[PDB]
Design an enzyme around this catalytic site. Structure first.
Site, PDB file in Angstrom:
ATOM      1  N   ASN A   9       0.842  -1.189   0.000  1.00 51.89           N
ATOM      2  CA  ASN A   9       0.000   0.000   0.000  1.00 51.89           C
ATOM      3  C   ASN A   9       0.880   1.243   0.000  1.00 51.89           C
ATOM      4  O   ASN A   9       1.391   1.656   1.044  1.00 51.89           O
ATOM      5  CB  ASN A   9      -0.957  -0.003   1.203  1.00 51.89           C
ATOM      6  CG  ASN A   9      -1.982   1.131   1.155  1.00 51.89           C
ATOM      7  OD1 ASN A   9      -2.084   1.866   0.170  1.00 51.89           O
ATOM      8  ND2 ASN A   9      -2.751   1.270   2.229  1.00 51.89           N
ATOM      9  N   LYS A  11      -0.097   4.175  -0.530  1.00 52.20           N
ATOM     10  CA  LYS A  11      -0.914   5.285  -0.022  1.00 52.20           C
ATOM     11  C   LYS A  11      -0.793   6.524  -0.922  1.00 52.20           C
ATOM     12  O   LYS A  11      -0.696   6.385  -2.142  1.00 52.20           O
ATOM     13  CB  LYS A  11      -0.596   5.576   1.453  1.00 52.20           C
ATOM     14  CG  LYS A  11      -0.872   4.383   2.372  1.00 52.20           C
ATOM     15  CD  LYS A  11      -0.654   4.704   3.839  1.00 52.20           C
ATOM     16  CE  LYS A  11      -0.936   3.482   4.705  1.00 52.20           C
ATOM     17  NZ  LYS A  11      -0.880   3.786   6.161  1.00 52.20           N
ATOM     18  N   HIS A  94     -10.181   0.766   4.236  1.00 54.36           N
ATOM     19  CA  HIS A  94      -8.953   1.167   4.925  1.00 54.36           C
ATOM     20  C   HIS A  94      -9.295   2.241   5.951  1.00 54.36           C
ATOM     21  O   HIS A  94     -10.068   3.159   5.658  1.00 54.36           O
ATOM     22  CB  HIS A  94      -7.900   1.685   3.942  1.00 54.36           C
ATOM     23  CG  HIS A  94      -6.523   1.772   4.527  1.00 54.36           C
ATOM     24  ND1 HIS A  94      -6.107   2.838   5.296  1.00 54.36           N
ATOM     25  CD2 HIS A  94      -5.473   0.922   4.463  1.00 54.36           C
ATOM     26  CE1 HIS A  94      -4.858   2.640   5.679  1.00 54.36           C
ATOM     27  NE2 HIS A  94      -4.450   1.485   5.186  1.00 54.36           N
ATOM     28  N   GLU A  96      -8.000   4.815   7.147  1.00 54.69           N
ATOM     29  CA  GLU A  96      -7.771   6.207   6.762  1.00 54.69           C
ATOM     30  C   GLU A  96      -8.955   6.797   5.996  1.00 54.69           C
ATOM     31  O   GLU A  96      -9.196   8.004   6.055  1.00 54.69           O
ATOM     32  CB  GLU A  96      -6.477   6.335   5.954  1.00 54.69           C
ATOM     33  CG  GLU A  96      -5.218   6.239   6.809  1.00 54.69           C
ATOM     34  CD  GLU A  96      -3.994   5.776   6.038  1.00 54.69           C
ATOM     35  OE1 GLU A  96      -3.013   5.369   6.694  1.00 54.69           O
ATOM     36  OE2 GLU A  96      -4.000   5.812   4.788  1.00 54.69           O
ATOM     37  N   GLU A 164      -6.604  -4.372  10.934  1.00 52.09           N
ATOM     38  CA  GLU A 164      -5.877  -3.153  11.269  1.00 52.09           C
ATOM     39  C   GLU A 164      -6.005  -2.837  12.762  1.00 52.09           C
ATOM     40  O   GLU A 164      -7.072  -2.417  13.219  1.00 52.09           O
ATOM     41  CB  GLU A 164      -6.387  -1.975  10.432  1.00 52.09           C
ATOM     42  CG  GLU A 164      -5.955  -1.988   8.973  1.00 52.09           C
ATOM     43  CD  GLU A 164      -6.364  -0.723   8.236  1.00 52.09           C
ATOM     44  OE1 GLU A 164      -7.580  -0.492   8.069  1.00 52.09           O
ATOM     45  OE2 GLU A 164      -5.464   0.040   7.824  1.00 52.09           O
ATOM     46  N   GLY A 170      -0.762   5.237  15.742  1.00 49.43           N
ATOM     47  CA  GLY A 170      -0.835   6.638  16.161  1.00 49.43           C
ATOM     48  C   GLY A 170      -0.938   6.840  17.663  1.00 49.43           C
ATOM     49  O   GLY A 170      -1.016   7.975  18.140  1.00 49.43           O
ATOM     50  N   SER A 210       1.815  -2.085  11.624  1.00 50.41           N
ATOM     51  CA  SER A 210       3.154  -1.706  11.177  1.00 50.41           C
ATOM     52  C   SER A 210       4.003  -2.935  10.849  1.00 50.41           C
ATOM     53  O   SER A 210       4.282  -3.764  11.719  1.00 50.41           O
ATOM     54  CB  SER A 210       3.849  -0.834  12.225  1.00 50.41           C
ATOM     55  OG  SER A 210       5.099  -0.367  11.746  1.00 50.41           O
TER      56      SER A 210
END
Lengths: 247, 246
Positions: A9, A11, A94, A96, A164, A170, A210
């Site tokens: 990905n 992004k 996803h 995001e 995920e 974060g 990650s």
């Protein structure tokens, strides 16, 4: 055995020159595509550039697909358009897009529905936030997220699931391979009881946290982790080492 | 002012249909220094469309991210568009305002990012049927324009589009005189906020229902400087709409 699945990905990143450099290093890796799935997801406008540069052993896809079909929807890319261009894979749900672009569970369903209708293969993402895990709602949230689309799956080689761990993204928290493994195991059990035992044993479930050159081996060795959706590390030449861990 | 005719293909097209469409488009002989003609294909069709279309036709994308390069899955940044030499972007189209939660603040952030990376923007706005019937046409459009108008430093590189939402989807139609009246109001808003020279410089396009039959009557209105064409731009006869502004 399940065919492993390593996804890149990219992004919202990349230039024409950087992709040319990155794809050339990727092409140097010798692997059998009949035994390992390796998919690169560039920006929509970079798709043609990326597809032409990558060797056929590499599969390609797009990072989002419309819940709408063809028509008056400015800025949208339908599954019908993707099929005509022979785009093989799509990313749906996803975090995001759920975070910044109002994407809901019902949007995810309609996207998968449209994708499968047009013979596209889908990489569907889901997962729980920090607040949800701390309240012990991990199973509840994932159950709700999976059941929103799971009935639409008609081929269990053609839909790939991604966990995920938003609670580890974060924030200050870090997800271990076995913490992911136990979630993956529960996801597969949900598929088992909603779709069937053979179907659950077929479906790929990828880790979507990650992933780097150092942790990829410890992640892939887990019984219910069938690969990764890789972020930042897929923009580096060293991504070939992450692919090699699943070889 | 230089006239501006834009083809918004929206979410439509195949590789075969685009080749047939760009074929008829390319056969039209026009001067690029006298008239701007821009085609907006689907993002994944951009490379195919740009290659097929001769350079007299400008090209762009139907949306651009409010974010720059980074962890934003599914997004196309202005930086990325600059690297690919994408000349134009559409910002604030009513369909994204309607279906995709796009707000006046999103429009502002998209415009700032576009002009920062030397992209030219086609910025859309307009009022609903309820708003027009409540005599809020000027109020709504003033608010929508004010959201982004201060960012414009080159009035050739920002192109405004009036979308009569009250005449889109409803059973009601906009007369050329009605379109002209709103265009004049829009130019007054730019005059009141930026200046007289800036208002007389900026292109204001009609973004309602445009076809081969009504284009000449619309383009001859004093304050209409072109069109953002939807359905009729998916036909070979779109060349006749371009001809009306030539």
């Amino acid at each position: 055995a399940r065919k492993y699945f390593v996804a890149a990905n990219w992004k919202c990143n990349g230039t024409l020159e950087s992709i040319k450099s990155l794809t050339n290093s990727f092409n140097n890796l010798d692997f059998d595509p009949s035994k390992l799935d390796v998919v690169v997801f560039p920006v929509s406008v970079h798709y043609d550039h990326t597809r032409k540069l990558l060797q056929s052993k590499f599969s390609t896809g797009i990072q989002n697909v419309s819940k709408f079909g063809n028509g008056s929807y400015t800025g949208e890319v339908s599954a019908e358009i993707a099929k005509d261009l022979n785009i093989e894979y799509v990313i749906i749900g996803h975090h995001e897009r759920r975070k910044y672009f109002h994407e809901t569970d019902e949007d995810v369903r309609e996207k998968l529905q449209a994708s499968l209708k047009n013979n596209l293969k889908a990489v569907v993402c889901f997962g729980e936030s920090l607040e949800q895990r701390e309240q012990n709602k991990t199973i509840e949230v994932i159950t709700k997220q999976v059941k929103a689309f799971v009935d639409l799956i008609d081929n269990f080689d053609n839909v790939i699931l991604v966990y995920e761990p938003l609670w580890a993204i974060g924030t200050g928290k870090t997800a271990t391979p076995e913490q992911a493994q136990l979630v993956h195991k529960e996801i597969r059990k949900i598929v088992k009881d909603t779709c069937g035992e053979k179907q659950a044993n077929q479906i790929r479930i990828l880790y979507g946290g990650s992933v780097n050159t150092e942790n990829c081996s410890s992640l892939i060795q887990q019984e219910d982790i069938d690969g990764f959706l890789v972020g930042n590390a897929s923009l580096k030449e060293s991504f070939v080492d992450i692919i090699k861990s699943a070889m």
